Amino acid sequence: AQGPVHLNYRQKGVIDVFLHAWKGYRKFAWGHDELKPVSRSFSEWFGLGLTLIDALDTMWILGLRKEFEEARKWVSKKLHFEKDVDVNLFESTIRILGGLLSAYHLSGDSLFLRKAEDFGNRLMPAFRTPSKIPYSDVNIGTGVAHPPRSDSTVAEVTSIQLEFRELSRLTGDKKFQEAVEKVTQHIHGLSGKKDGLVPMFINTHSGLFTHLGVFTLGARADSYYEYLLKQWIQGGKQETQLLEDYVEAIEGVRTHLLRHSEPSKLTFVGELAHGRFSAKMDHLVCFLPGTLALGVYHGLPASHMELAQELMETCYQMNRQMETGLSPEIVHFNLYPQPGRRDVEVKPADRHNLLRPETVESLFYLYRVTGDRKYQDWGWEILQSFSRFTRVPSGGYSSINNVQDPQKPEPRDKMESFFLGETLKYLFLLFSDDPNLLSLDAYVFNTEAHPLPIWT
Ligand SMILES: [Ca+2]
């Protein structure tokens, strides 16, 4: 139990956490999608070693080469896509394809690229629709795609571009990029948006937005905005339409979803349903200050930086206002000026924490762009909370049901793959004082924290 001497104490700490988490995966869920830390068991979503693949690049970046080699062997011998299983196009793309692509780039091991190309081909049947807008699910073994148990969600079909574009770039096979870019282009000219803000669903037959008039930056839409900017960055900042749509969208957020709480005036993003504003902010929305800061770094308006800094503070508060120091799934703010009234309110139904990375993810970007060490300090505090309230003695960490009860957080007995793929990776990078480590200038992270090279 020892780590490299050159590591500053905070990265060192992240590694200790990763090791305790991995200890659980190896002992009770090796080769399985997710670990059930409490019951020392495991769960299967796709049956593709999800946690392992999602953690490949994180292990490499943390210098856990021994563990990486071991995981590599499993991919080499146990990973088989010749399976009769339905997978979500979006979910499998960001974790499996994205994870394999990053692993390939960091290790230089062709195995990961071979698996990526295999997986990518099995996903293509999803685009066989009248509109070319892909179905939500696709059976990687039978080759048949189909809608949800309905239309497809907008964020899902517009948050797979980074991965598909890179696969085409590496293989020379243009079908991946062309299919994915068709979607992006179709969305670009689609009416039904509200100043850049997009609806949550789109019909695969008509190719039109559905559930019109309802807008959120949380689930079903969050990554759409994220990928407009990241694709532009990935392509060497030459695709102006992407930039324009992004800039328009941020203005749309300002004009329609941005409000301030009372009495502290915390800047937050709410939801809009047919003209009615809802002061409801899912933790998922905390990806925004990071994306905003990332844009500023690449030449976007300084107003984006002000907004970034304000939302980072709010996100930080969503975490720190809780008794465990961990943000709940959803937070309701107050617009009603009332003396004794606070700003943050959480409904008993939304007090869970699934070990989400959104806050630490944005801390990473805010730090890289501003250089303010307070963002590192904030991340260290959140890590402490994960260690104190989610740690499972036998190994691993678990999502919890009550973020407001430090005496009884109530483990849900589940470690999501993104805890190791995203949360611990962003924290490790946040604590790095080397701006050249996965520089914002040379790499762009997909929505599951898998770095991809910026095209030259
Ligand atoms: Ca994400």
Shortest CA distance to 162 belongs to which of 421, 443, 422? 443
What's this structure's resolution in Å? 1.9
- Please give the single-letter amino acid code of residue 424: L
Tell me, in angstroms, the distance from the centre of ligand 1 to residue 407's CA.
Answer: 30
Tell me, in angstroms, the distance from the centre of ligand 1 to residue 449's CA.
Answer: 7
Shortest CA distance to 309 belongs to which of 321, 298, 296, 319? 296
Tell me, in angstroms, the distance from the centre of ligand 1 to residue 337's CA.
Answer: 34
Tell me the CA end-to-end span of the chain in Å, nearest whole number.
Answer: 41
Cα-based distances in Å from 218 to 240, 272, 433, 436: 25, 12, 31, 31
Tell me, in angstroms, the distance from the centre of ligand 1 to residue 263's CA.
Answer: 31
Residues in the chain: 456
Q: How far apart are CA 207 and CA 131, in angstroms?
A: 5
Q: How far apart are CA 188 and CA 177, in angstroms?
A: 16
The CB density around residue 292, as the number of other CB atoms within 10 Å, is 29
Annotated binding site for Ca(2+): 447
Strand ranges of the sheet holding 86-88, from the earlier edge strand across to the other edge: 86-88, 137-139, 145-146
The CB density around residue 374, as the number of other CB atoms within 10 Å, is 14
The CB density around residue 339, as the number of other CB atoms within 10 Å, is 6
Is 91 known to be catalytic? Answer: yes
Torsion, Cα 20 91 105 454, to 10 degrees, reads: -120
What angle (nearest 5°) sits at the alpha carbon of residue 126, between those of residues 122 and 132?
135
Structure tokens at 381: 């505090």
Tell me, in angstroms, the distance from the centre of ligand 1 to residue 445's CA.
Answer: 10
Structure tokens at 249: 């969208």
Q: How far apart are CA 76 and CA 310, in angstroms?
A: 46
Cα-based distances in Å from 235 to 125, 164, 227, 392, 452: 26, 13, 12, 42, 11
Catalytic-role residue among 34, 163, 358, 413: 358
Is 329 known to be catalytic? Answer: yes
Annotated binding site: 447
Tell me the sheet residues that pair with 156: none
Name the region of 123 (left: φ>0; alpha: ψ -120 to 50; beta: rest): alpha
Q: How far apart are CA 310 and CA 295, in angstroms?
A: 15
Q: How far apart are CA 278 and CA 275, in angstroms?
A: 10
Structure tokens at 203: 């019909």
Tell me the sheet residues that pair with 152: 202
CA dihedral sign, ordered 404, 285, 218, 306: positive
Structure tokens at 310: 């304000």
Tell me, in angstroms, the distance from the centre of ligand 1 to residue 5's CA.
Answer: 32
SS3 string, the chain, reads CCCCCCCCHHHHHHHHHHHHHHHHHHHHCCCCCEEECCCCEEECCCCCCHHHHHHHHHHHHCCCHHHHHHHHHHHHHHCCCCCCCEEEHHHHHHHHHHHHHHHHHHHCCHHHHHHHHHHHHHHHHHHCCCCCCCCCEEECCCCCEECCCCCEEHHHHCCCHHHHHHHHHHHCCCHHHHHHHHHHHHHHHCCCCECCECCCEECCCCCCEECCCEECCCCCCHHHHHHHHHHHHHCCCCCHHHHHHHHHHHHHHHHHCEEECCCCCCEEECEEECCEEECEEEHHHHHHHHHHHHHHHCCCCHHHHHHHHHHHHHHHHHHHCCCCCCCCCEEEECCCCCCCCCCEECCHHHCCECCCCHHHHHHHHHHHHHCCCHHHHHHHHHHHHHHHHCECCCCCECCECCCCCCCCCCECCCECHHHHHHHHHHHHHHCCCCCCCCCCCCEEECCCCCEEECCC
Q: How far apart are CA 365 and CA 201, in angstroms?
A: 29
Do the Cβ atoms of 236 and 455 come closer than 8 Å? yes
Helix 358-370 vs helix 374-389: crossing angle, to nearest 10 = 160
CATH of domain 1-456: 1.50.10.10
Please give the backbone phi and psi of residue 250, each rounded to the nearest 5 degrees, phi first.
-65, -35
Is 222 known to be catalytic? Answer: yes
Q: How far apart are CA 95 and CA 55, in angstroms?
A: 9
**Count of CA atoms in the C-beta half-sphere (13 A) of 401:** 7
Q: How far apart are CA 414 and CA 424, in angstroms?
A: 16
Q: How far apart are CA 7 and CA 429, in angstroms?
A: 12
Tell me, in angstroms, the distance from the centre of ligand 1 to residue 223's CA.
Answer: 6
Catalytic-role residue among 34, 137, 222, 413: 222
Sequence-distant (≥ 6) Cβ neighbours of residue 430 within 8 angstroms: 360, 363, 364, 367, 375, 376, 379
Q: How far apart are CA 162 and CA 147, in angstroms?
A: 23
The residue with tokens 């088989």 is 80
Shortest CA distance to 92 belongs to which of 68, 120, 59? 120
Do the Cβ atoms of 168 and 159 come closer than 8 Å? no
Tell me, in angstroms, the distance from the centre of ligand 1 to residue 286's CA.
Answer: 10
Strand ranges of the sheet holding 201-202, from the earlier edge strand across to the other edge: 152-153, 201-202, 209-210
Q: How far apart are CA 330 and CA 335, in angstroms?
A: 16
Q: How far apart are CA 273 and CA 215, in angstroms?
A: 6
Domain boundaries, the chain: 1-456
Shortest CA distance to 170 belongs to which of 224, 227, 112, 125? 112
Tell me, in angstroms, the distance from the centre of ligand 1 to residue 341's CA.
Answer: 32
The residue with tokens 């693949």 is 53
The CB density around residue 201, as the number of other CB atoms within 10 Å, is 22
Structural Rg of the chain based on CA atoms: 21
Which technique was the structure solved with, according to the deposited record? Answer: X-ray
Tell me the sheet residues that pair with 239: none
Q: How far apart are CA 261 and CA 440, in angstroms?
A: 32
What angle (nearest 5°) sits at the alpha carbon of residue 413, between those of residues 412 and 419?
90
Catalytic-role residue among 33, 54, 67, 91: 91
The residue with tokens 């004082």 is 433
**Count of CA atoms in the C-beta half-sphere (13 A) of 51:** 30
Do the Cβ atoms of 307 and 254 come closer than 8 Å? yes
- Please give the single-letter amino acid code of residue 53: I
Tell me the sheet residues that pair with 43: 34
